[PDB]
Amino acid sequence: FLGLTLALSKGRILEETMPLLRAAGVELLEDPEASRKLIFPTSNPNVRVLILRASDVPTYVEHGAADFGVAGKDVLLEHGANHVYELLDLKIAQCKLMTAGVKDAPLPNRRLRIATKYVNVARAYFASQGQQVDVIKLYGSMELAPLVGLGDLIVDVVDTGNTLRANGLEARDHICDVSSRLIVNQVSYKRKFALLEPILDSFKNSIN
Amino acid sequence: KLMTAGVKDAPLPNRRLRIATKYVNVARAYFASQGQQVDVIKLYGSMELAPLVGLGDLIVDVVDTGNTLRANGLEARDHICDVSSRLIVNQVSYKRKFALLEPILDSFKNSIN
Amino acid sequence: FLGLTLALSKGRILEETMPLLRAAGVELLEDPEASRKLIFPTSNPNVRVLILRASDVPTYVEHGAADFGVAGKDVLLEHGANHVYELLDLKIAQCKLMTAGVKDAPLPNRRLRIATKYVNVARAYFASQGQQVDVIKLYGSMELAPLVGLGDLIVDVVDTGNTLRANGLEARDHICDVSSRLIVNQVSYKRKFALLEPILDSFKNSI
Amino acid sequence: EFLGLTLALSKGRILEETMPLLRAAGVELLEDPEASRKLIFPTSNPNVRVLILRASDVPTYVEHGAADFGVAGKDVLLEHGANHVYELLDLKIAQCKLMTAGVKDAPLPNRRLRIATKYVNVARAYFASQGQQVDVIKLYGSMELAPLVGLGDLIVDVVDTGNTLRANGLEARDHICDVSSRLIVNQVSYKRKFALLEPILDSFKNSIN
Amino acid sequence: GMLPDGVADVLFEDAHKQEVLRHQLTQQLITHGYQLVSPPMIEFTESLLSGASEDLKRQTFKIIDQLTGRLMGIRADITPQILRIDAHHGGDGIARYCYAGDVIHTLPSGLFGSRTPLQLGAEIFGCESIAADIELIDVLFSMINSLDMSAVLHVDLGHVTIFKRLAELAALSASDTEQLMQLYANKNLPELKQVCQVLPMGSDFYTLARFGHDIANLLGRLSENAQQDTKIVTAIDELQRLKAHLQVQWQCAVSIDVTELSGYHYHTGIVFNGYINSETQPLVRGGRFDPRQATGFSMDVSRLLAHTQLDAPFIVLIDYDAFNNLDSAQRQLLLQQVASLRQQGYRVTMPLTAEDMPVGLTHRLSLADNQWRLHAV
Amino acid sequence: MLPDGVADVLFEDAHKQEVLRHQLTQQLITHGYQLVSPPMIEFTESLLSGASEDLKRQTFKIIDQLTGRLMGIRADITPQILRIDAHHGGDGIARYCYAGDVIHTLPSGLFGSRTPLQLGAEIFGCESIAADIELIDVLFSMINSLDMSAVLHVDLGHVTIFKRLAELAALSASDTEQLMQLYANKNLPELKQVCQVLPMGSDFYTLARFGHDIANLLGRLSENAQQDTKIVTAIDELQRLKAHLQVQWQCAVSIDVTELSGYHYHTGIVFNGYINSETQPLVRGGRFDGPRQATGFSMDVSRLLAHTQLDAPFIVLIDYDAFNNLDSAQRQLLLQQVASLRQQGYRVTMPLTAEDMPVGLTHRLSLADNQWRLHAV
Amino acid sequence: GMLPDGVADVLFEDAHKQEVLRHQLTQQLITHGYQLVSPPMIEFTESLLSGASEDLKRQTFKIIDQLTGRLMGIRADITPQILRIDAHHGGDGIARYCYAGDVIHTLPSGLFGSRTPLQLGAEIFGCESIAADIELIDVLFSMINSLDMSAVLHVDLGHVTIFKRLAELAALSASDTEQLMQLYANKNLPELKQVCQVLPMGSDFYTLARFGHDIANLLGRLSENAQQDTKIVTAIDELQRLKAHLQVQWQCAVSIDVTELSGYHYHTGIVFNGYINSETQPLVRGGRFDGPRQATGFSMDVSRLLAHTQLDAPFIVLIDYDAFNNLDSAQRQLLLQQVASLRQQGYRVTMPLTAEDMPVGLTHRLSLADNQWRLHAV
Amino acid sequence: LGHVTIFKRLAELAALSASDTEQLMQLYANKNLPELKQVCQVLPMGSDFYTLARFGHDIANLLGRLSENAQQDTKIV
Ligand SMILES: [Cl-]
Ligand SMILES: [Cl-]
Ligand SMILES: [Cl-]
Ligand SMILES: [Cl-]
Ligand SMILES: [Cl-]
Ligand SMILES: [Cl-]
Ligand SMILES: [Cl-]
Ligand SMILES: [Cl-]
Ligand SMILES: [Cl-]
Ligand SMILES: [Cl-]
Ligand SMILES: [Cl-]
Ligand SMILES: [Cl-]
Ligand SMILES: [Cl-]
Ligand SMILES: [Cl-]
Ligand SMILES: [Sr+2]
Ligand SMILES: [Sr+2]
Ligand SMILES: [Sr+2]
Ligand SMILES: [Sr+2]
Ligand SMILES: [Sr+2]
Ligand SMILES: [Sr+2]
Ligand SMILES: [Sr+2]
Ligand SMILES: [Sr+2]
């Protein structure tokens, strides 16, 4: 395959990205949800897409198995974005990385336990606040952790906060703002700019 | 069972093999016990895609029937080890709450025989 | 002993230093040459002297077994003078460090062999000339080495050069100028300056 | 120019005790070295000349081939390293022994001991074999003074009678090893010039009994 | 011997003495208002060697944290850790810290030195005044005096500001600064004289080495441009105050060397070096350092061992046979008596066998007429 | 900022750590144990001589720049005690104690320390169970001196029992490993299965099922097991220690003869002291190898900090203005008074300025009615 | 000094010559059926120093792998790496390996010797027969002969088995073995004679030093207990076969020294030492060693051949700057074709960047005269 | 192809600190355009530094997109 391979995150990112893709001439030919398929062709025959778990997007892109991708800045911060180019803030799927604890429970004045997917972000953040922590890696959902004492706080992405409140939790501290970004493989940017440029101009235009 | 898996009838490249897997530690351990050097790539999601777009040469995954592998143009290669579900217990809870645990453990033990 | 211990070199340095000592109030009570004695008292009861091989002077001084000493700059350069203070050029026993070879024998085009006491000086010098060498440490006299092919050159101190010519050798390159120096232990300079100062002023004036 | 054997001899006492062995092998000096401003000495055998060196330079001249063979104390050989020469004969002359020595009845300090010595490598080796840590200070000249002005706690030196130690308020402490003069030979000279060496070595061997 | 160069066991009575010294000196500092901190032996090099000199970097062993792949160091000096601690905990006002802990060096720092010193120190942060340096001197000398040594401490004062201002005003290159520093370290007066003839303000640099010891007249020997620099004037004034304080208050022999420029990197002003008798390496090193003021000192506790003495210990052995003949109630009373002896600092061994013999035995606890009593051996 | 398993101990915690280290060290010394303070680094030749694979992985490696040879930072002090006893201890009984920092490459337990302050005691050269009883006495005397509310639970094991059964039943390496794994996991069902097809498999099952009841363990074992002297002696040792701990010290004791951690280094009886319900033992001890007998224990002093309390400190500030208004003779009297307070352990700060404020201030020393006195804040 | 002791640049024609030697000698080995392997300069000490002598350990620089915290070495010898490689890849049958690579030593052997030799070697695994040692000799001598040196290689054969069997049969202590070995190393016959009067079978140990060179009669001078040891008999037989083979097949000067016991640790039988002219340190060291796997091999420092080998003078050519820039495009293309041809034949042709651009050691100009580019010497 | 002179001349002409040079270099290495845009709004000649990352690939027109001070630097040209 001599064209571009585009890595997309599952779920909400896919919904909000479809418009940008259609504007750049790259609509999916079929629905991914009702498909037992891994590599998807598009209306442009030089572009195919991969539908990945969000945390795998930077991995596929930096290793060149996809030439470019759409990934949350939360994922990029947690992963490390040293081996890709973060070309565009797509200003979609806005949310923010936050600490969160039990509703109206005060912070204990001891070493905190953080239970989170975002282990590196968590370490970095609590370091910048000069605070010592014990971090516990979780792969799944995090809202349960404080409720059974696994950790005192969690680090998670929060939009509305409805999920937190529905589980007796509340956002505490704001870590940073998060949105989806267009990342590009370093080699693909050099070797395949001619294929990328129109699509990047279209995305840039679709944002304003 | 935990198995290595690759593209159907694709030959081993002469260079250092790339493993794309959830099971990073198992992968390192296994290929170490075969005296083989590997480059491991951590994946969090589904793994069947990785060999098909060249992310890695092989994957390590749990396989039952293997229908998922064949349906994606992949084939099981090596058997790593057998896998089944286990009952694990917290060390402190085993000491502090044995009275609550024992009947439940006896029932599970009996349900297996 | 609460006074100053002064380390002196054996032969020529001792002759040329005696005047400076007498002027600063520190004459020996007796002749060292005709004496089976190691620590010598002086006319000043706060000063005693040690008569050492020249290469041991910096050793006794830096370790504080002598508070100050007279040593050739050749010795100091070879030894390392990092742990002592070189206070005074006494302008005595002037000579110079030189390379030397067989008379009118040309330098071979291959890697040179240096046979010398002054191993560190030799390495440093030939390094500064961008020249590669094989150095051979000698403890005794060096004039013989080129005559039996042990090395191509020697590094040695030369005054007149009479010893070189008498053995069919000639001075070749000038490395640096050498004279005797007054060295002082770092701690002794701080703790015992009151005892040292007059003696150092007298030496400075005697020069 | 010179196709014969070059023999390296140590200056003082070794020279006295070696002259007999040389005369028996046909290699007397033509003149007195003490009253001579001369570096290479011819002998009654025209295939042999001698060099009169400081003792510590004997192994150096021999291993580098500037002398084909030499007479050196085992103290010198141990200190220098004798890896590049052949120690062919114990000449059983200039017997003495390597010893530690300290101030008379001075007790060992509780801290790490300081050794002031010519024999730096021997000193390190010896105190290592006794499982003891030391700080060694190299001296080139006489060593008897060092303990008396606190340069070191002990010295390592060759001791025969011990008169020099006692006369300076020092006493022998430990025996390190026995020392005598040895005949050393250059590796290449042993292979290339055995025919010249053999009679002289047989004569030395016989002179020892 | 089995151990590396510059690495030594401290055993038996020496270890006991080291423990007493460390504890007493620590307690003294605590009672003068210094907060004890005990940072760890290892940190990530990011923190440990933040703004470290090239020397401190070479002195610090590197090791790899297998949990992160990152570089850690084993501390060669505690002071940077005190900086880290004061940044997070100290605020803007005055703060006092003390410490005592092992540090490790890659190489011995001078001839025959230790690579495993037990570093004890005190530091005052957040005070600009020379009064903080004077308090530290008073604390140090109070500590030294508590040790009842016959060995005497000589103090050498320097002040890095003087040479740094001269280096500024004369606009010296890196090369020329290095060369003067090397020459100063060696007090090589002849070669310094030569180099100074061809340097800008070279007369002043020569004066530092030749007449720096005479601090009463140093200002008046300096050039006009030097004499009109306030920092140079203040520095020389600080030296004169400390010198006077040490002589008046403590009867201390003080020498001055304004060319003492070890730790040109970390020192920012006055420096102190305390020498014990005629030992080459200073027992005590101290100075001003580094938007926060700081001054402090440190020492190797282990170097005090040779100059300090404790009373003979009382080492007691209970008689084996007599003890095993006791009934249970007699044993309990003896043990109560032994506990009391131990509370008073007697070292009491309860023998496992008839041959069980404590090292350095001084007394037996023996049974006569239904009574246990001590008698010397 | 700091690596995982690496922590500052600061302020009152550091003070408390210093008190604990000092008191516990002194207690050991008064029981006849010789204090030794080996260095943090040695050549791996000595440091890792006869080390387990685990100890090797736990030990950081560094290079001695003076010799090119490999050194380690100690992860455990016991091998250094072996080294020390070989050179200094002779053939008789010898007692050693120690307290020093050790470093581990990886934490042992979830969020556990890689920089423990390891304190211990060891008895060499005594075959008798009496040496293990003396150690228990020393340990419990120390624990009791701490006035904790936390309770120490003791678990006793004895590796000899399983090792003799493994010998007598001629088990393979494979089968030994499998039983050990099954014991570690308390997997009774799979153990029962594996034991039906093993020689003397009945005895291996009995260890896991009835090992806790040490009074009857011998009588449940097979005839071949019951006639093994080593098995009999081991069970006898367990019964003596258990009784001694309960009688003399009112200790809760559990027995687990399937406890086989350190199968490598342990050669007999083993002790594990747990504090409340903490997963990792506070104290680990037991018999090991010096042909020289050895037994001992060690603990991380830093883990005592959470369970120990000191009295509130008195932190005193002298009034700045009042002090500077004093004449010389008034100052000398105040300083005498301050010295006295400091001797009693009051932490007295002499202020540098009017704003100089000690952390945690509790009292001012103030001037009222021609008299200096403490008043709370 | 600019560079450390025992560390030297190899520059210019010497470097060219080193490259030719390395390449030719490697190719020769490959054409004799030896498989080339190129192991890395660094390994974990677990593998690199597995069963290493104390000497090899001291010779090996240590470094730390920052990825694992574990200890690595820079190789001082390639043979242990060949063992590692043969364990994984070689099977139970015969396997042949060759190699050429840099090794580093902490200290020189020999006064002013190299610490950075370019170690080239060949090894045969899995053959018990003396035939494997004979094949290696053939390979080695074919290589030596291809070099067209005037320097002569002298071969010294030893065999450690002989002294080891005598040491066993006479039940010598560690102390006594060390003392005999020291005395052998120094050829100290008088003190050896003394020590041997008071040792069991001491007569045989003396005979090794005094009559070991005469291998035809060594067996018959030995004691009855020695003569009835099969290993002693076989060893002496092996020496006689190699000696004969070297003299007959290769016209080699062979000396025998059964007291040659360097590498008592690693050698397990026959040993070979090749000396170039009268150089003290052997150019070639070889002999039997351990892989239960048989192994024999040799190695040499290629850099020590540089002083004894010669290449033809090179042709170093400069194209004339002015003439070239005066050419039209089609004339340039023809010249470049001619230059390409010269380069294919091994002429070193510089295309000048400027009129002053001057190759070092210039021998010819390629110049324009009539309608023709031609070489003319300078 | 690249050319370090261009950024070094811009860093000179804009008189950048060590800190600011390091930050731009880190951002360039990552081709982080959003954060670079932010940092460049508050830097002297920051427009030129942004242009390098955004339009450096089009070398035919790079000179004409640069500032007047940049365009008059001979080394840049
Ligand atoms: Cl598909
Ligand atoms: Cl939400
Ligand atoms: Cl919320
Ligand atoms: Cl399946
Ligand atoms: Cl399949
Ligand atoms: Cl001349
Ligand atoms: Cl005596
Ligand atoms: Cl002694
Ligand atoms: Cl000690
Ligand atoms: Cl009575
Ligand atoms: Cl009061
Ligand atoms: Cl050699
Ligand atoms: Cl085989
Ligand atoms: Cl043509
Ligand atoms: Sr410090
Ligand atoms: Sr006092
Ligand atoms: Sr232990
Ligand atoms: Sr209590
Ligand atoms: Sr009062
Ligand atoms: Sr080899
Ligand atoms: Sr030929
Ligand atoms: Sr902005």
Short mmCIF file of N, CA and C in Angstrom, two decimals, chain D residues 32-102:
data_model
loop_
_atom_site.label_atom_id
_atom_site.label_comp_id
_atom_site.label_asym_id
_atom_site.label_seq_id
_atom_site.Cartn_x
_atom_site.Cartn_y
_atom_site.Cartn_z
N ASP D 32 89.87 -1.00 37.85
CA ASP D 32 88.99 -0.68 38.99
C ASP D 32 87.88 0.28 38.53
N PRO D 33 86.60 -0.10 38.72
CA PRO D 33 85.48 0.80 38.35
C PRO D 33 85.34 2.05 39.25
N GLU D 34 85.58 1.88 40.57
CA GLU D 34 85.51 2.98 41.56
C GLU D 34 86.34 4.22 41.20
N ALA D 35 87.55 3.99 40.68
CA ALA D 35 88.48 5.07 40.28
C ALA D 35 88.48 5.27 38.75
N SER D 36 87.30 5.22 38.13
CA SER D 36 87.16 5.29 36.67
C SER D 36 85.91 6.06 36.25
N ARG D 37 86.11 7.02 35.35
CA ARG D 37 85.03 7.81 34.75
C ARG D 37 84.60 7.12 33.44
N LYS D 38 84.24 5.84 33.54
CA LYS D 38 83.97 5.00 32.36
C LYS D 38 82.68 4.18 32.57
N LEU D 39 81.93 4.01 31.47
CA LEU D 39 80.56 3.44 31.52
C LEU D 39 80.47 2.01 30.98
N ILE D 40 81.15 1.74 29.87
CA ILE D 40 81.28 0.40 29.31
C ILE D 40 82.70 -0.12 29.61
N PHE D 41 82.79 -1.25 30.32
CA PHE D 41 84.09 -1.84 30.71
C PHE D 41 84.38 -3.12 29.92
N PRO D 42 85.58 -3.21 29.30
CA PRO D 42 85.97 -4.47 28.64
C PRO D 42 86.47 -5.48 29.67
N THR D 43 86.55 -6.74 29.27
CA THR D 43 87.03 -7.83 30.15
C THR D 43 88.17 -8.62 29.48
N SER D 44 88.76 -9.56 30.24
CA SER D 44 89.82 -10.44 29.73
C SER D 44 89.34 -11.35 28.60
N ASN D 45 88.04 -11.67 28.63
CA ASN D 45 87.33 -12.27 27.50
C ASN D 45 86.90 -11.12 26.59
N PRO D 46 87.29 -11.17 25.30
CA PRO D 46 86.89 -10.10 24.38
C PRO D 46 85.44 -10.19 23.87
N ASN D 47 84.76 -11.31 24.11
CA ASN D 47 83.32 -11.45 23.81
C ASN D 47 82.38 -10.93 24.91
N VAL D 48 82.93 -10.43 26.02
CA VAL D 48 82.12 -9.96 27.14
C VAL D 48 82.57 -8.55 27.53
N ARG D 49 81.60 -7.66 27.68
CA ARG D 49 81.83 -6.33 28.28
C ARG D 49 80.85 -6.19 29.44
N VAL D 50 81.13 -5.30 30.39
CA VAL D 50 80.18 -5.10 31.50
C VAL D 50 79.71 -3.66 31.65
N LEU D 51 78.48 -3.53 32.13
CA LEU D 51 77.89 -2.25 32.51
C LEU D 51 77.75 -2.23 34.04
N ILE D 52 78.12 -1.09 34.64
CA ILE D 52 78.02 -0.89 36.09
C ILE D 52 76.88 0.11 36.31
N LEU D 53 75.76 -0.40 36.80
CA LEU D 53 74.49 0.33 36.90
C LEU D 53 74.03 0.43 38.34
N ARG D 54 73.16 1.41 38.61
CA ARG D 54 72.38 1.37 39.84
C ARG D 54 71.56 0.06 39.81
N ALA D 55 71.45 -0.59 40.96
CA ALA D 55 70.88 -1.95 41.03
C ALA D 55 69.47 -2.05 40.43
N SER D 56 68.63 -1.05 40.67
CA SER D 56 67.25 -1.04 40.17
C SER D 56 67.11 -0.92 38.65
N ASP D 57 68.17 -0.46 37.97
CA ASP D 57 68.23 -0.42 36.50
C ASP D 57 68.69 -1.71 35.83
N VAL D 58 69.25 -2.66 36.58
CA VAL D 58 69.72 -3.91 35.99
C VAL D 58 68.59 -4.63 35.23
N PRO D 59 67.43 -4.89 35.87
CA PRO D 59 66.35 -5.55 35.13
C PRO D 59 65.88 -4.81 33.89
N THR D 60 65.93 -3.47 33.94
CA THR D 60 65.51 -2.62 32.83
C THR D 60 66.43 -2.84 31.62
N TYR D 61 67.74 -2.71 31.81
CA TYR D 61 68.69 -2.95 30.72
C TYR D 61 68.59 -4.36 30.14
N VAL D 62 68.38 -5.36 30.99
CA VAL D 62 68.31 -6.74 30.55
C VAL D 62 67.02 -7.03 29.77
N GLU D 63 65.85 -6.71 30.32
CA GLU D 63 64.59 -7.03 29.61
C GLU D 63 64.45 -6.36 28.23
N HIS D 64 64.95 -5.11 28.11
CA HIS D 64 64.97 -4.36 26.85
C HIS D 64 66.12 -4.79 25.89
N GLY D 65 67.00 -5.69 26.33
CA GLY D 65 68.08 -6.21 25.49
C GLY D 65 69.31 -5.34 25.34
N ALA D 66 69.39 -4.23 26.06
CA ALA D 66 70.62 -3.40 26.11
C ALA D 66 71.76 -4.09 26.87
N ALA D 67 71.41 -5.09 27.67
CA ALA D 67 72.36 -6.05 28.21
C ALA D 67 71.74 -7.40 28.03
N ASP D 68 72.57 -8.40 27.74
CA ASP D 68 72.07 -9.76 27.47
C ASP D 68 71.78 -10.50 28.75
N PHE D 69 72.53 -10.17 29.80
CA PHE D 69 72.34 -10.80 31.12
C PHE D 69 72.86 -9.89 32.23
N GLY D 70 72.44 -10.18 33.46
CA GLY D 70 72.78 -9.31 34.58
C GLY D 70 72.70 -9.98 35.94
N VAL D 71 73.30 -9.32 36.92
CA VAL D 71 73.22 -9.75 38.31
C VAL D 71 72.39 -8.72 39.08
N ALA D 72 71.30 -9.18 39.68
CA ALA D 72 70.38 -8.32 40.40
C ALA D 72 69.87 -9.00 41.64
N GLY D 73 69.67 -8.21 42.69
CA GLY D 73 69.04 -8.69 43.92
C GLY D 73 67.60 -9.08 43.67
N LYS D 74 67.14 -10.12 44.36
CA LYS D 74 65.75 -10.58 44.27
C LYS D 74 64.77 -9.54 44.80
N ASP D 75 65.23 -8.68 45.70
CA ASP D 75 64.45 -7.51 46.13
C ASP D 75 64.15 -6.59 44.95
N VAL D 76 65.16 -6.33 44.13
CA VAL D 76 65.00 -5.51 42.94
C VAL D 76 64.05 -6.19 41.95
N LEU D 77 64.26 -7.49 41.71
CA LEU D 77 63.45 -8.24 40.77
C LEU D 77 62.00 -8.29 41.22
N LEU D 78 61.77 -8.51 42.51
CA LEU D 78 60.40 -8.54 43.02
C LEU D 78 59.70 -7.21 42.87
N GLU D 79 60.43 -6.14 43.16
CA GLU D 79 59.89 -4.79 43.08
C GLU D 79 59.62 -4.38 41.65
N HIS D 80 60.56 -4.69 40.77
CA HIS D 80 60.47 -4.33 39.36
C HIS D 80 59.40 -5.11 38.60
N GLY D 81 59.26 -6.40 38.91
CA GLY D 81 58.59 -7.37 38.03
C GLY D 81 59.68 -8.06 37.20
N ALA D 82 59.73 -9.39 37.26
CA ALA D 82 60.72 -10.20 36.50
C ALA D 82 60.04 -11.06 35.41
N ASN D 83 58.95 -10.57 34.88
CA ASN D 83 58.10 -11.27 33.89
C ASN D 83 58.78 -11.39 32.52
N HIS D 84 59.59 -10.40 32.14
CA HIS D 84 60.23 -10.35 30.83
C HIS D 84 61.68 -10.86 30.77
N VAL D 85 62.18 -11.39 31.88
CA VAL D 85 63.52 -11.97 31.92
C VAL D 85 63.46 -13.39 32.45
N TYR D 86 64.57 -14.09 32.27
CA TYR D 86 64.75 -15.44 32.82
C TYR D 86 65.64 -15.35 34.05
N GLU D 87 65.13 -15.76 35.20
CA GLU D 87 65.90 -15.90 36.44
C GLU D 87 66.55 -17.31 36.46
N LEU D 88 67.74 -17.38 35.89
CA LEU D 88 68.44 -18.64 35.66
C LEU D 88 69.11 -19.22 36.89
N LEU D 89 69.77 -18.37 37.68
CA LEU D 89 70.55 -18.82 38.82
C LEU D 89 70.32 -18.00 40.06
N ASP D 90 70.15 -18.69 41.19
CA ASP D 90 70.42 -18.09 42.50
C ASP D 90 71.93 -18.19 42.77
N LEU D 91 72.61 -17.04 42.71
CA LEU D 91 74.04 -16.97 42.95
C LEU D 91 74.44 -17.08 44.44
N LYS D 92 73.46 -17.12 45.35
CA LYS D 92 73.72 -17.27 46.80
C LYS D 92 74.78 -16.26 47.29
N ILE D 93 74.76 -15.04 46.76
CA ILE D 93 75.61 -13.95 47.24
C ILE D 93 74.72 -12.78 47.69
N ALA D 94 75.33 -11.86 48.44
CA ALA D 94 74.65 -10.71 49.03
C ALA D 94 73.30 -11.10 49.67
N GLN D 95 73.34 -12.13 50.51
CA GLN D 95 72.16 -12.57 51.24
C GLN D 95 71.76 -11.51 52.26
N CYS D 96 70.46 -11.32 52.35
CA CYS D 96 69.86 -10.45 53.33
C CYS D 96 68.39 -10.84 53.31
N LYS D 97 67.51 -10.00 53.85
CA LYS D 97 66.07 -10.27 53.75
C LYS D 97 65.27 -8.99 53.77
N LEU D 98 64.11 -9.04 53.11
CA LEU D 98 63.18 -7.92 53.08
C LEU D 98 62.40 -8.00 54.37
N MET D 99 62.31 -6.87 55.07
CA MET D 99 61.63 -6.82 56.35
C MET D 99 60.84 -5.54 56.49
N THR D 100 59.77 -5.59 57.29
CA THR D 100 59.16 -4.37 57.82
C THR D 100 60.00 -3.90 59.00
N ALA D 101 59.93 -2.62 59.31
CA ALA D 101 60.66 -2.06 60.44
C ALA D 101 59.97 -0.79 60.94
N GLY D 102 60.01 -0.58 62.25
CA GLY D 102 59.41 0.57 62.91
C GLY D 102 60.27 1.14 63.99
#
